[PDB]
Amino acid sequence: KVFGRCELAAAMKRHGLDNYRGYSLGNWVCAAKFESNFNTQATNRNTDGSTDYGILQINSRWWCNDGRTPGSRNLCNIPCSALLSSDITASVNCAKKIVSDGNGMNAWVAWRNRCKGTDVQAWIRGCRL
Numbered sequence: 001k002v003f004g005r006c007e008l009a010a011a012m013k014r015h016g017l018d019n020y021r022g023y024s025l026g027n028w029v030c031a032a033k034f035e036s037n038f039n040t041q042a043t044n045r046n047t048d049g050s051t052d053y054g055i056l057q058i059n060s061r062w063w064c065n066d067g068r069t070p071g072s073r074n075l076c077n078i079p080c081s082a083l084l085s086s087d088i089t090a091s092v093n094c095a096k097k098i099v100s101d102g103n104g105m106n107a108w109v110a111w112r113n114r115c116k117g118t119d120v121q122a123w124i125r126g127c128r129l
Contacts, residue, residue, distance in 0.1 A: 001086035003038040003055070005029060006127035008088075013129055015092040021099045025129070026120030027111070028095075032056055033123065034110035040091075041084050054083035054091045056108065063094055 003011065009029050012018060018025040035057035036042035044052045050061035050069045060069040064080035076094035083091050098107050105111045 026123040029123035030115035031111040053080045
């Protein structure tokens with residue numbers, strides 16, 4: 001599924017991400033935009049052999065099991081495929097754990113390099129939330 005901007009904002013809010021660990025909803029929407037262009041089915045292989053999955057490009061190195069990332073963990077206790085669902089529950093639950101891990105949203109390299117410090121409220125501008 002390819003979410004629209006306000007549609008995703010709404011889904012994130014419904015799943016409790018709005019202001020989670022102090023990160024406004026625009027921050028989450030901006031991260032999703034640059035990680036996956038709002039496409040739940042996005043997958044991208046990393047040079048180390050891990051893969052990033054889903055709207056928020058969650059890495060198999062630590063967070064999910066894809067069966068092909070040696071030495072990796074699965075700290076969200078989920079198959080990485082669950083992160084590709086049209087329903088964002090699994091992605092959201094796992095992102096909650098990620099953003100709680102110590103470095104906040106810096107875990108998302110695209111958020112640090114493209115969202116951090118910017119006018120992230122633009123992402124939810126005009127949305128009925």
